[PDB]
């Protein structure tokens, strides 16, 4: 990220710790919690809100020493109040902005806001689990602040997990009780919490809604998944993501070895050894030199990070994902639950920033053989059948005689997210109750208003709605300020926060009373429907037939003879 990025970043940090002073109040609350009494604080938003807030609420013991790589352990009780009135640190990561690594191991927190502690009925419960690819991310409020969640009267609800290697470190030897999901098993904890404490805060806890973004979809969909967590919550939105997209999981088994020697590791690759050179590296050592691990190969094939979601080698106590995610969708309890899912109208056009770096990545699309699903093909991509695939791949986004970088990222919207929802939606159907599931298109382009991820994509004066574009509009950061209340861009908060309370109250999207909405008739997809129908959201909000179908329908003729891996 450019110099001129970092500096203008750097004045933004100094100008949030000075604007969330400011916004600060003197008003203080002390909640119960299960743990012992929490000390909250009020604070202001620019538009003239309030809200009470609980930060750094822990929901596991700080996984240090020997905690780490291991699953989460409920934190001990205090007699006395805890400080909640300020946030605690992000798990150990790599800053995107400055590229040194930042963050502790003393990172498994939540964070809890609401308009009024005092409701004269219990409330929903919103829960925000944020993406950043399972390697970075954070639930502090310079970017995701929950200023405009507070106008409607929910709980809001934003948690903190293990990322990276910390979080995602796999081994297979039972012996060594490092199974993998370390960082969805704190997502587990975190929710056992929320059950069990929000009527505390004013919340219903028998109308909780977990929703995420991109890995926090994914994450959102894993505790779908999980036996760990059946009956915990009530509601899930599944914005842009989902635990089979590509790169949800993998199998890491093998990468342990590779980051200690990066690390400075000598001896051999047996599990034992590898561990406990690991157990006692510096975390940002670890961290740092992630970026590493991925062969050439891997990344070839696609694979986007080292460590992740895994399918975990033995079953513990813990153990939150014990077969792939496909097989999981077969027996899910989160199936019978009201579902949303959606994605934006150009989320591939993300890519660019990575495009630029390597324009090479565009003559992939000659033959579109490394696009083909892993589970599909050839271990060199060389296959007839390989080829034949992935000129289907080809026939579906390359539009002339040579492939652009638009067709690329027109196709990086497929691989990455459309197809794998509509392969999640075909094999939920086959093992559902019946609840419905609504689907949304986000389509509404501003440069007005902007978040952080612009930065990181390069998405400066670039038109289209990239993967990412819409948590301007759920989430207050650092970049954000005051919008007139006429304007587009407010308007689409209103309607955002407003679609998303409406869910989570009642399971159905759709109200009246959201501006722009008379004339939708926002039905559920059925089993029977050849074509998806999901209401657009831009300057208008319209209901149409997903515009991404006939490509969809192209990838799946891939799996024509192999309809059994679909």
Known sequence: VSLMEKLKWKIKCIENKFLNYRLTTNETVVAETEYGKVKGVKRLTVYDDSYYSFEGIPYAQPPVGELRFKAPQRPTPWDGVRDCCNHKDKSVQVDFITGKVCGSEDCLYLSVYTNNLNPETKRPVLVYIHGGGFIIGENHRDMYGPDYFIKKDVVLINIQYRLGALGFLSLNSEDLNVPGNAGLKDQVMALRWIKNNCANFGGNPDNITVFGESAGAASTHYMMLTEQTRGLFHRGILMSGNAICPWANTQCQHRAFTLAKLAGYKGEDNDKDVLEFLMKAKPQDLIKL??????????????????????????????????????????????????????????????????KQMPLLVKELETCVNFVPSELADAERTAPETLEMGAKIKKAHVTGETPTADNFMDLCSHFYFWFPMHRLLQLRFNHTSGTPVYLYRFDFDSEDLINPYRIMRSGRGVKGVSHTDELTYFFWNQLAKRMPKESREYKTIERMTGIWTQFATTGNPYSNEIEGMENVSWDPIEKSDEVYKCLNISDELKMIDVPEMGKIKQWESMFEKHRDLF
């Open 290 to 355: 992630e970026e590493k691990v991925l062969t050439l190969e891997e990344r070839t094939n696609k694979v986007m990070f080292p460590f992740g979601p895994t399918v975990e080698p033995y079953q513990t106590a813990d153990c939150v994902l014990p077969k792939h995610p496909r097989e999981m969708v077969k027996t899910a309890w989160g199936n019978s639950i009201p579902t949303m899912m959606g994605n934006t109208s150009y989320e591939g056009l993300f890519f660019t920033s990575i495009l």
